[PDB]
Design an enzyme around this catalytic site. Structure first.
Site, mmCIF file in Angstrom:
data_model
loop_
_atom_site.group_PDB
_atom_site.id
_atom_site.type_symbol
_atom_site.label_atom_id
_atom_site.label_comp_id
_atom_site.label_asym_id
_atom_site.label_seq_id
_atom_site.Cartn_x
_atom_site.Cartn_y
_atom_site.Cartn_z
ATOM 1 C CB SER A 242 -0.973 0.100 0.938
ATOM 2 O OG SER A 242 -1.704 -1.213 1.002
ATOM 3 C CE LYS B 268 -4.730 1.762 -0.498
ATOM 4 N NZ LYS B 268 -4.066 0.519 -0.468
ATOM 5 C CB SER C 110 -4.308 0.999 4.122
ATOM 6 O OG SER C 110 -3.281 0.522 3.083
ATOM 7 C CD1 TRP D 35 1.189 -7.198 6.022
ATOM 8 C CD2 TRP D 35 0.011 -6.188 7.759
ATOM 9 N NE1 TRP D 35 1.113 -8.061 6.846
ATOM 10 C CE2 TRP D 35 0.509 -7.661 8.063
ATOM 11 C CE3 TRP D 35 -0.584 -5.568 8.616
ATOM 12 C CZ2 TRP D 35 0.073 -8.202 9.240
ATOM 13 C CZ3 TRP D 35 -0.622 -5.999 9.890
ATOM 14 C CH2 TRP D 35 -0.505 -7.223 10.101
ATOM 15 N NE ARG E 263 2.387 -1.678 9.593
ATOM 16 C CZ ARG E 263 1.309 -1.637 8.799
ATOM 17 N NH1 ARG E 263 1.346 -1.920 7.300
ATOM 18 N NH2 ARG E 263 0.234 -1.381 9.410
HETATM 19 B B1 OZ0 Z 1 -1.820 -2.316 2.039
HETATM 20 O O1 OZ0 Z 1 -2.013 -1.796 3.221
HETATM 21 O O2 OZ0 Z 1 -0.572 -3.065 2.005
HETATM 22 C C1 OZ0 Z 1 -3.129 -3.298 1.620
HETATM 23 C C2 OZ0 Z 1 -2.701 -4.022 0.186
HETATM 24 C C3 OZ0 Z 1 -1.400 -4.769 0.167
HETATM 25 N N1 OZ0 Z 1 -2.716 -4.256 2.736
HETATM 26 S S1 OZ0 Z 1 -4.039 -5.327 2.981
HETATM 27 O O3 OZ0 Z 1 -5.358 -4.940 2.512
HETATM 28 O O4 OZ0 Z 1 -3.628 -6.582 2.832
HETATM 29 C C4 OZ0 Z 1 -4.101 -5.548 4.747
HETATM 30 C C5 OZ0 Z 1 -4.106 -4.153 5.477
HETATM 31 C C6 OZ0 Z 1 -3.149 -3.406 5.829
HETATM 32 C C7 OZ0 Z 1 -3.226 -2.272 6.450
HETATM 33 C C8 OZ0 Z 1 -1.806 -1.274 6.658
HETATM 34 O O5 OZ0 Z 1 -1.953 -0.632 7.609
HETATM 35 O O6 OZ0 Z 1 -0.918 -1.235 5.627
HETATM 36 C C9 OZ0 Z 1 -4.354 -1.479 6.237
HETATM 37 C C10 OZ0 Z 1 -5.705 -2.266 6.044
HETATM 38 C C11 OZ0 Z 1 -5.443 -3.746 5.707
#
Ligand code: OZ0
Length: 244
Positions: A50, A53, A97, A190, A230
């Site tokens: 993410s 983004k 996110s 994440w 983190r």
């Molecule tokens: B991203 O936040 O990295 C998103 C897409 C890879 N992560 S997720 O949907 O698999 C799990 C997630 C992570 C987070 C975060 O804080 O990075 C927030 C919500 C959901």
């Protein structure tokens, strides 16, 4: 008065005690500093997850695929997380996110323009492959922690190839913490669609005097870790170095 050996030992211990392996890169002016308990991660490639983004939003705003006040309506389908089952601006989706909102933005941009813009910015390995809606989650796009901190440095100083206004609008979406007189702008990541899983927190500290200190934390998210590790490791590291 604190020795470099002691700063290095303290920041390493934050990653050790979290039972993870990771690095945090700090940039002061042009100089990179690398701390943590797995320093060789600094120049290895990982999916941006993410953290992408930030660039997705820059691309979509610059190319008129969304405005900062546009409300992306929840389509009423069950989401992976209930906090995403709501209507959101890009900024609210940044803070939550909310993958689905940024997948909609990526689909509006479309594969051709997305690839051209990712290449134009020279982000990571620059390769988005053939699927416009998931390339930052499962590959093929990858980026190193050094590249992430340099991207944060560029954004913090309005040096990316977008209008100043576009960069300012995205930076407003990234304010995550205010500490004494400092402001921390950052985006977490994440990557749960990869093995091992990757965790990120990339951004910068704006100090009261206006100096901007970019950083990028990169670690391995393990079974049952909280995402807040983190943030906690990052803040403790910035505090230990006297950056906040
Ligand atoms: B991203 O936040 O990295 C998103 C897409 C890879 N992560 S997720 O949907 O698999 C799990 C997630 C992570 C987070 C975060 O804080 O990075 C927030 C919500 C959901």
């Amino acid at each position: 008065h604190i020795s470099s050996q002691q700063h290095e030992k303290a920041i390493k211990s934050y990653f050790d005690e979290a039972q993870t392996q990771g690095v945090i890169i700090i940039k002061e002016g042009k100089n990179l500093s690398t701390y943590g308990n797995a320093l060789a991660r600094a120049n290895k490639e990982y999916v941006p997850a993410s953290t992408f983004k930030m660039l997705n939003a820059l691309i979509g705003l610059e190319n008129h695929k969304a405005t900062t006040n546009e409300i992306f309506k929840w389509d009423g389908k069950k989401r992976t997380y209930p906090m995403w089952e709501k209507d959101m601006t890009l900024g609210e989706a940044m803070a939550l996110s909310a993958v689905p909102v940024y997948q909609e933005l990526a689909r509006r941009t479309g594969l051709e323009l997305m690839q051209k813009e990712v290449k134009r910015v020279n982000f990571g390995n620059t390769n988005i492959g053939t699927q416009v809606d998931n390339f930052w989650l499962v590959g093929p796009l990858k980026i190193t922690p050094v590249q992430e901190v340099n991207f944060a440095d560029d954004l913090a100083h309005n040096r990316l190839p977008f209008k100043l206004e576009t960069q300012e609008e995205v930076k407003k979406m990234l304010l995550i913490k205010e500490v004494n007189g400092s402001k921390i702008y950052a985006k977490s990541g994440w990557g749960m669609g990869v093995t091992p899983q990757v965790g990120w927190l990339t951004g910068w500290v704006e100090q009261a005097n206006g100096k901007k200190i970019p950083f990028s934390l990169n670690l391995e998210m393990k079974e049952g870790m909280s995402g807040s590790i983190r943030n906690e490791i990052t803040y403790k590291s910035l505090e230990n170095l006297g950056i906040i």
